[PDB]
Design an enzyme around this catalytic site. Structure first.
Site, PDB file in Angstrom:
ATOM      1  N   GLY A   1      59.937  29.217  31.269  1.00 30.41           N
ATOM      2  CA  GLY A   1      60.363  28.547  30.057  1.00 30.41           C
ATOM      3  C   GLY A   1      59.929  29.252  28.784  1.00 30.41           C
ATOM      4  N   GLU A   2      59.864  28.514  27.688  1.00 28.81           N
ATOM      5  CA  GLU A   2      59.432  29.116  26.443  1.00 28.81           C
ATOM      6  C   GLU A   2      58.737  28.088  25.561  1.00 28.81           C
ATOM      7  OE1 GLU A   2      63.242  30.577  25.049  1.00 28.81           O
ATOM      8  OE2 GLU A   2      63.420  28.984  23.571  1.00 28.81           O
TER       9      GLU A   2
ATOM     10  N   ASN B   1      46.672  32.232  28.824  1.00 31.70           N
ATOM     11  CA  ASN B   1      46.527  30.775  28.967  1.00 31.70           C
ATOM     12  C   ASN B   1      45.324  30.239  28.185  1.00 31.70           C
ATOM     13  OD1 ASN B   1      48.804  30.365  30.500  1.00 31.70           O
ATOM     14  ND2 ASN B   1      47.748  30.644  32.467  1.00 31.70           N
TER      15      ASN B   1
ATOM     16  N   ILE C   1      57.847  31.185  19.737  1.00 29.61           N
ATOM     17  CA  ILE C   1      56.523  31.764  19.574  1.00 29.61           C
ATOM     18  C   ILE C   1      55.901  32.167  20.902  1.00 29.61           C
ATOM     19  CG2 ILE C   1      56.027  30.650  17.386  1.00 29.61           C
ATOM     20  CD1 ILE C   1      54.459  28.519  19.013  1.00 29.61           C
ATOM     21  N   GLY C   2      56.517  31.788  22.006  1.00 27.84           N
ATOM     22  CA  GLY C   2      55.998  32.247  23.279  1.00 27.84           C
ATOM     23  C   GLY C   2      56.997  32.176  24.406  1.00 27.84           C
ATOM     24  N   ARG C   3      56.819  33.043  25.394  1.00 30.84           N
ATOM     25  CA  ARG C   3      57.640  33.067  26.595  1.00 30.84           C
ATOM     26  C   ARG C   3      56.798  33.029  27.855  1.00 30.84           C
ATOM     27  NH1 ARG C   3      62.210  33.407  24.381  1.00 30.84           N
ATOM     28  NH2 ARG C   3      64.182  33.670  25.509  1.00 30.84           N
ATOM     29  N   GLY C   4      57.180  32.189  28.802  1.00 33.80           N
ATOM     30  CA  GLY C   4      56.547  32.198  30.099  1.00 33.80           C
ATOM     31  C   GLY C   4      57.566  32.613  31.134  1.00 33.80           C
ATOM     32  N   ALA C   5      57.131  32.724  32.380  1.00 34.78           N
ATOM     33  CA  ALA C   5      58.032  33.011  33.472  1.00 34.78           C
ATOM     34  C   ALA C   5      59.128  31.937  33.603  1.00 34.78           C
ATOM     35  CB  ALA C   5      57.246  33.137  34.770  1.00 34.78           C
TER      36      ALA C   5
ATOM     37  N   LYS D   1      56.794  23.024  24.245  1.00 33.03           N
ATOM     38  CA  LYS D   1      56.913  23.799  25.476  1.00 33.03           C
ATOM     39  C   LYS D   1      58.115  23.292  26.254  1.00 33.03           C
ATOM     40  CE  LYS D   1      54.006  25.218  29.454  1.00 33.03           C
ATOM     41  NZ  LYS D   1      52.586  25.257  29.932  1.00 33.03           N
TER      42      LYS D   1
ATOM     43  N   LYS E   1      43.624  32.952  32.725  1.00 33.96           N
ATOM     44  CA  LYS E   1      43.879  34.336  32.334  1.00 33.96           C
ATOM     45  C   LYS E   1      44.115  34.310  30.832  1.00 33.96           C
ATOM     46  CE  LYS E   1      48.676  33.889  33.799  1.00 33.96           C
ATOM     47  NZ  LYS E   1      49.589  33.854  34.975  1.00 33.96           N
TER      48      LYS E   1
HETATM   49  N1  LIG Z   1      50.112  24.750  21.556  1.00 32.95           N
HETATM   50  C1  LIG Z   1      50.447  26.009  21.339  1.00 32.95           C
HETATM   51  N2  LIG Z   1      50.266  26.546  20.118  1.00 32.95           N
HETATM   52  C2  LIG Z   1      50.625  27.830  19.921  1.00 32.95           C
HETATM   53  N3  LIG Z   1      51.161  28.707  20.791  1.00 32.95           N
HETATM   54  C3  LIG Z   1      51.308  28.132  21.979  1.00 32.95           C
HETATM   55  C4  LIG Z   1      51.008  26.847  22.346  1.00 32.95           C
HETATM   56  N4  LIG Z   1      51.307  26.587  23.662  1.00 32.95           N
HETATM   57  C5  LIG Z   1      51.801  27.757  24.073  1.00 32.95           C
HETATM   58  N5  LIG Z   1      51.857  28.709  23.126  1.00 32.95           N
HETATM   59  C6  LIG Z   1      52.299  30.119  23.199  1.00 32.95           C
HETATM   60  O1  LIG Z   1      53.164  30.258  24.333  1.00 32.95           O
HETATM   61  C7  LIG Z   1      52.557  31.090  25.330  1.00 32.95           C
HETATM   62  C8  LIG Z   1      52.985  30.595  26.721  1.00 32.95           C
HETATM   63  O2  LIG Z   1      52.843  29.172  26.827  1.00 32.95           O
HETATM   64  P1  LIG Z   1      52.188  28.606  28.167  1.00 32.95           P
HETATM   65  O3  LIG Z   1      51.482  27.360  27.825  1.00 32.95           O
HETATM   66  O4  LIG Z   1      51.244  29.599  28.849  1.00 32.95           O
HETATM   67  O5  LIG Z   1      53.461  28.271  29.151  1.00 32.95           O
HETATM   68  P2  LIG Z   1      53.877  29.025  30.468  1.00 32.95           P
HETATM   69  O6  LIG Z   1      53.153  30.293  30.626  1.00 32.95           O
HETATM   70  O7  LIG Z   1      55.409  29.282  30.431  1.00 32.95           O
HETATM   71  N6  LIG Z   1      53.587  28.015  31.764  1.00 32.95           N
HETATM   72  P3  LIG Z   1      51.985  27.926  32.291  1.00 32.95           P
HETATM   73  O8  LIG Z   1      51.856  28.674  33.672  1.00 32.95           O
HETATM   74  O9  LIG Z   1      51.718  26.491  32.588  1.00 32.95           O
HETATM   75  O10 LIG Z   1      50.917  28.477  31.298  1.00 32.95           O
HETATM   76  C9  LIG Z   1      51.091  30.959  24.999  1.00 32.95           C
HETATM   77  O11 LIG Z   1      50.173  31.832  25.664  1.00 32.95           O
HETATM   78  C10 LIG Z   1      51.137  31.083  23.462  1.00 32.95           C
HETATM   79  O12 LIG Z   1      51.253  32.436  23.062  1.00 32.95           O
HETATM   80 MG   LIG Z   2      51.109  30.497  30.541  1.00 33.36          MG
END
Ligand SMILES: Nc1ncnc2c1ncn2[C@@H]1O[C@H](COP(=O)(O)OP(=O)(O)NP(=O)(O)O)[C@@H](O)[C@H]1O
Ligand SMILES: [Mg+2]
Length: 333
Positions: free
Chosen positions: A20-21, A136, A14-18, A37, A133
């Site tokens: 991880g996922e 987040n 459901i999500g991707r970061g730089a 996460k 941002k």
């Molecule tokens: N608890 C959650 N419920 C639903 N979607 C989530 C949740 N946590 C993360 N996501 C989805 O995943 C995306 C990226 O997760 P995120 O927490 O920003 O990790 P990241 O970007 O890889 N590392 P970080 O720099 O710490 O934010 C989010 O913006 C959502 O779209």
């Molecule tokens: Mg993030």
């Protein structure tokens, strides 16, 4: 005894970061649904720093803020860090802005106000979120804001570090073509490149306060600068300083007195413009410096209760039809 990967079933990414996922997962024995996460250890800071950040994060978990996503478990293997937290099916604010292009001033008022409360609550517990941002900012099942898990990945994107701009002077930018595009075209470019930007391990300083790149140092007020940038993006369609490259964006950020402007053709209130300019000025006079009450009493927040906002209907109804509804997230391949 301690939980690990085998105790969960991945349902969907459901999500991707730089670095991880994030997955929707099901705890096998209970059938309950969670967001998991995953962060790659090879991308993380050294083990000692990671451990101290996770330790201090449990203080935040203990405080159990309304305004931070609820975190239940954490474990690790040789490759990854794992965090099990509540699944928030409203999605993130980046994706919401992708679908709506811009928000009304009333919608903006709501999200900014809730985010003011969210940021203040972590500041009260001793945390500086140095990466505010829209991607987040999460929305829960009733459409209210929570900060996603933060702390481990702060400053890891290459363009979020001072070193990245070492031999680059602070003179005004040079992308005159880009600058003279109408607002609508800036908005389109920003949107077209938005998802890639979020996944990039380089990124941009679009949301970073200028003092963060100064030898002088910074403080918790950097978060309020970021919120101002988000507010501008919500109303206008792109953050004030965006460019084709992080170098130009950086030059635009450092010259905010000249580069922070409102496009003549875009409708925005006098109140909204004033607040954005109070968020996005030098930290010594930035709104909030003497305390968060200065932000809360800003004329732009006129109708806001601020005791009951999170307990009343949200600006936008989250439309979901199951507890594992992932329709508010992009697809990931
Ligand atoms: N608890 C959650 N419920 C639903 N979607 C989530 C949740 N946590 C993360 N996501 C989805 O995943 C995306 C990226 O997760 P995120 O927490 O920003 O990790 P990241 O970007 O890889 N590392 P970080 O720099 O710490 O934010 C989010 O913006 C959502 O779209
Ligand atoms: Mg993030």
């Amino acid at each position: 005894t301690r939980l690990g990967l085998e105790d969960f079933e991945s349902l969907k990414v459901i999500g991707r970061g730089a670095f991880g996922e994030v997955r929707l997962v099901q705890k096998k024995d209970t059938g309950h649904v969670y967001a998991m996460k995953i962060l790659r250890k090879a991308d993380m800071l050294e083990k000692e720093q990671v451990g101290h950040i996770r330790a201090e994060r449990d203080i935040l978990v203990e405080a159990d803020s309304l305004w931070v996503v609820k975190m239940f478990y954490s474990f690790q293997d040789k490759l990854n860090l794992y965090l099990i937290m509540e699944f928030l099916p409203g999605g993130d604010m980046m994706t919401l802005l992708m679908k709506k292009d811009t928000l009304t001033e009333e919608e903006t008022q709501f999200y900014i106000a809730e985010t003011v409360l969210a940021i203040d609550s972590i500041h009260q517990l001793g945390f500086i979120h140095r990466d505010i941002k829209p991607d987040n900012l999460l929305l829960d099942s009733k459409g209210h804001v929570k900060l996603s898990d933060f702390g481990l990945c702060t400053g890891l994107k290459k363009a979020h570090r001072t070193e990245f701009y070492r031999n680059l002077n602070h003179s005004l930018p040079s992308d005159f073509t880009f600058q003279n595009m109408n607002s609508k075209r800036k908005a389109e470019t920003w949107k077209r490149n938005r998802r890639q930007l979020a996944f990039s391990t380089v990124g941009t300083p679009d949301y970073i306060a200028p003092e963060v790149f100064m030898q002088t140092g910074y403080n918790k007020l950097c978060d309020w600068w970021s919120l101002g940038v988000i507010m501008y993006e919500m109303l206008i369609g792109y953050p004030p300083f965006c460019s084709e490259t992080p170098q130009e964006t950086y030059k635009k950020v450092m010259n905010w007195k000249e580069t922070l402007t409102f496009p003549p053709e875009v409708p925005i209130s006098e109140k909204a413009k004033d607040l954005i300019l109070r968020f996005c000025c030098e930290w010594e006079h930035r709104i909030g410096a003497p305390g968060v009450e200065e932000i809360k009493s800003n004329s732009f927040f006129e109708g806001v209760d601020w005791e009951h906002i999170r307990e009343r209907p949200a600006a936008i109804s989250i439309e979901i039809k199951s507890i594992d509804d992932t329709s508010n997230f992009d697809e990931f391949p």
